[PDB]
Each structure stands twice: as structure tokens, then as C-alpha cells.
């Protein structure tokens, strides 16, 4: 069974801010 999708937080160095992005575990 495929693991349910989740939102992860990633911080970019571009302007120093972080974004929450949905990342779905692959099958």
C-alpha cells in the first residue's frame, strides 16, 4: 500500500524563508 501524502517544511536560502510543500511518498 502506498504511504499517504504529507506536507514537509523546506527552508530556502534564496531569501531565508521556509515553505510547506506537499510531498507524496512514491509507490
Shape category: rod-shaped
Portion in beta strands? 35-45%
Strand order of the largest sheet: 1-2
Largest sheet: 2 strands, antiparallel
Structural class: mainly beta
Helix content: under 10%
From the structure above, extract its key features.
two-stranded antiparallel sheet; 27 residues; monomer; mainly beta; rod-shaped; 2 strands
Structure description:
Helix content is 0%, strand content 44%. By secondary structure, it is mainly beta. The chain has no helices and 2 strands. It is rod-shaped, with a radius of gyration of 12 Å. A two-stranded antiparallel ribbon has the order 1-2. The chain has one domain.
Helices and strands, with pairings:
Elements: E1 6-11, E2 18-23
Antiparallel strand pairs: 1-2
Quick overview:
This protein has strands spanning 6-11, 18-23.
Amino acid at each position: 500500500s502506498c504511504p499517504p501524502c504529507m506536507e514537509v517544511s523546506s527552508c530556502d536560502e534564496e531569501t531565508g524563508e521556509c515553505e510547506i510543500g506537499s510531498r507524496c511518498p512514491p509507490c
